[PDB]
Structures are given as structure tokens and as C-alpha cells.
Amino acid sequence: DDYSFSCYSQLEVNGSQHSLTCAFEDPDVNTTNLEFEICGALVEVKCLNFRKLQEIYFIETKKFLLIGKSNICVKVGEKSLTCKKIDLTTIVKPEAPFDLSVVYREGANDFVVTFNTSHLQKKYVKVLMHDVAYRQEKDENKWTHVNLSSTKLTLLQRKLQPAAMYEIKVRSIPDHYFKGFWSEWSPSYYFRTPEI
């Protein structure tokens, strides 16, 4: 009865080409004869058809203008069920951070935690905010979160348990100009703190 949906775009996922990914909010919707289409703010083309896979709808294309709003419609045959005007730059899901690394500096008695990001967060200069989460790998229930705009974070050795395994991971969300959603978590990094 309700064909409401949500989408996320990703930018430069395969060279200069972007992607758009849409799915119904109701997981039980029969998608067998429902199609998705996007029209407007496209490069020299009126509309594009999504490809349907496993209840999800995908487009991979260079043809997003990224300036202005687009119209995304759920169609059965030619009949337009529901539509949504969306600026593709307001629903961006960043790629996950990666190559997480931890360095110990004995002199400073601290840990330098770095991670890698997109080509784009460097091209588009100040746009993402990152969320670094860590916790004692077992025993401890909830995570400790630190927000930052750069790719480098310091943890004081003496603010962590000694001789203990820590788990640490990172994710990103558009923070300036762009808007959107949390990336997937990076793969976790595990390390054991110095004994005392």
C-alpha cells in the first residue's frame, strides 16, 4: 500500500562514474513489476532506468550533473506510482575509510591513529567528517567515539588499559556542502597496548 523509498548516491566509484541506489522502506513490497526511473539534472539525456537486483535498484553512470534536483519515480508499466525530487549531492554515502594504522610513539607516550580516504575528500577539500570508534576488544560494551575532519588522531597511552587488545574502526559522513549518510565502517584494526 505504501511505495515509499530512500536512495543514496556515491561519487566517483569507478573512475569518473557515480552510482545511485534505491530501495523501498518496506522490505515486504513485491518489487516484481515495479521499476525505478530518474529524470532531470542529467547530462544530455532526459531519463535513465535503474537496474533491479535483489529488491535493490542501481544505476552506475557519468551522466549525473550533480547540480540541481532530479526526479526519481517508482513506475508500474507507464504508470507513475510515487515520485521524489532529490538533489543527488544531498544523499551521498561516502566510500568507507581504509588502510587504518596505529603507531606508538614512546617519547610522547601516545598512539597515532591514521586512516586513508577518497581521492575526492582531497579534491573537494574540506567536505567529510570522520567518526573513529574504539573499545577494549572484549569485556567493554560500548565504543568510544571521536569526531574529526582530518585523517590523524592521537590517543594517550595512559588513557587506555595496559596489555590489552583494542579494536578500532572508522567511518565518514558528508559534513560540508554535500549532505548524506554514514559510510560503511572501515575494517577493524586490532592492537595490543604496552605492558607496564
Binding mask 84-103 for ligand NGA (x = CB under 6 A): --------x-xx--------
**Is 117 an interacting residue with respect to ligand NGA (CB under 6 A)?**
yes
Stretch touching a copy of itself by CB under 8 A, among 38-46, 50-58, 111-119, 150-158: 38-46
Return the half-sphere exposure (C-beta side, CA atoms, 13 A cut-off) of residue 30: 4
* 129 touches a copy of itself (CB under 8 A): no
Q: Cβ(100)–Cβ(18) under 8 Å?
A: no
Residue 76 touches which member of a copy of itself, ligand NGA, none, C-beta under 5-8 Å by kind: none
How many CB atoms sit inside 10 A of residue 22's CB? Answer: 22
Q: Does 159 bind a copy of itself (CB under 8 A)?
A: no
Task: Output b/e per residue, 42-57; b: 16+ Cβ within 10 A.
Answer: beeeeebebeeeeeeb
In angstroms, the CA 33 to CA 29 distance is 11
Quick one: which segment of 10-18, 37-45, 63-71, 134-142 binds ligand NGA (CB under 6 A)? 10-18
Of 44, 78, 106, 195, which lies in the binding site for a copy of itself, with binding defined by CB under 8 A?
44
- Rounded Cα distance between 7 and 74, Å, is 12
Nearest distance from C-beta of residue 5 to a copy of itself, angstroms: 23
Answer for the pair 58, 19: CB distance below 8 angstroms, yes or no: yes
Q: Is 100 exposed, middle or buried (0-12, 13-18, 19+ CB in 10 A)?
A: middle
Q: Answer with the entry of a copy of itself, ligand NGA, none that 108 interacts with (C-beta below 5 to 8 A by kind).
A: none
Q: How far is the CB of 176 from a copy of itself (least distance, A)?
A: 6
Minimum CB distance to ligand NGA smaller for 120 or for 160: 120
Report the side by side order of strands in the sheet with 128-136. 144-148, 128-136, 165-174, 189-192
Residue 128 or 170: the one with the smaller Cβ distance to ligand NGA is 128
Cell 541506489 -> residue: 21
Binding of residue 128 to ligand NGA (CB under 6 A):
yes
Q: By CB under 6 A, is residue 11 in contact with ligand NGA? A: yes
The footprint of ligand NGA (CB under 6 A) covers 10-12, 92, 94-95, 117-118, 120-121, 124, 127-128
